[PDB]
Design a protein around this ligand. Sequence first.
Ligand code: NDP
Ligand code: LDT
Length: 313
Amino acid sequence: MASRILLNNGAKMPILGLGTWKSPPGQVTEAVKVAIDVGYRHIDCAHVYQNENEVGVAIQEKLREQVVKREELFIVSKLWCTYHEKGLVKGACQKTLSDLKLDYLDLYLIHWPTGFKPGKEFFPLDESGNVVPSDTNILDTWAAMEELVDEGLVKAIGISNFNHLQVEMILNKPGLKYKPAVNQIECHPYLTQEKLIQYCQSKGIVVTAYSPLGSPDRPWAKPEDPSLLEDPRIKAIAAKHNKTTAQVLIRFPMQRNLVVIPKSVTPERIAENFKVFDFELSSQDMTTLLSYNRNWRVCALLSCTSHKDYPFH
Ligand SMILES: NC(=O)C1=CN([C@@H]2O[C@H](COP(=O)(O)OP(=O)(O)OC[C@H]3O[C@@H](n4cnc5c(N)ncnc54)[C@H](OP(=O)(O)O)[C@@H]3O)[C@@H](O)[C@H]2O)C=CC1
Ligand SMILES: O=C(O)COc1cc(F)ccc1C(=S)NCc1ccc(Br)cc1F
């Protein structure tokens, strides 16, 4: 399969990227170096992941090594919730740029639709454990994102964890200058996202699927939770194709015209997850995988559920 998808900013985005949430800082530099060596050209980052400096060391070394050219990389990061303020967005982007050793990002996302009170804490809480909101809305945050394009800091802007009505708000913004290029959302066989995907695709927004393996390392995992990688129905499809279950789980979103960003810090798995361009799931395989939907989310957070803009129900 073709390795890149065309965005509505005219640029092409690699459909397979390396995720970096939870990648330890002492491991992620090697992970990214290995990823680039074995063919990855897209890295998904975020300031809140607390490892962009170390990701950046890897990127810079591979650029300095001339393993790749900067134009061939597609580096994504995300504006954290405590920086949804006019006067904070540029500096947040610039900190990410400085950490990543870059002079531009290929794509910068509003990480979650919810703004939180600015300050040192990423999740400022009241004394009863509720997140403390910001008054700033997604439209004003979007205007701030548009300025970053116009200043040359980012080539594309987009959104993440926006629900249907929030995407629509963005698209219906008075005076909208740049449409979102991407909506990055959780998506896998247990949370198949057909409705939100069709809406976004119908509007020309590319969807990136996060947690495609079900985020087995999520810190709130419980032993009784469903496990994609261990689901014998998925293992059976993998066996039929002489591929791993992870490879099926990665190929699945690719054939839905999604971008997908599996995370690993294990060199062998980083390579395994890239070897997904030489096999095809049938339509029956695809529909069978879709049938496993159970509306199950890795990423949700009780402390944020009363925020006016919390996306999920
Ligand atoms: N926008 C947002 O709000 C969010 C964005 N994301 C992004 O999406 C990325 C991917 O999602 P994430 O939640 O990290 O989880 P994934 O679904 O990518 O699962 C990662 C886990 O799977 C393991 N794994 C990777 N490859 C294999 C394999 N071939 N066989 C078996 N196990 C494997 C990893 O282990 P190991 O590393 O030990 O090899 C790790 O424990 C994130 O890292 C982040 O970049 C994720 C959540 C939210
Ligand atoms: O968020 C990520 O990329 C990956 O996950 C995280 C990554 C981090 F570095 C820190 C926290 C999270 C959490 S707890 N994320 C879930 C979450 C955060 C905010 C809101 Br609004 C809702 C929500 F569900």
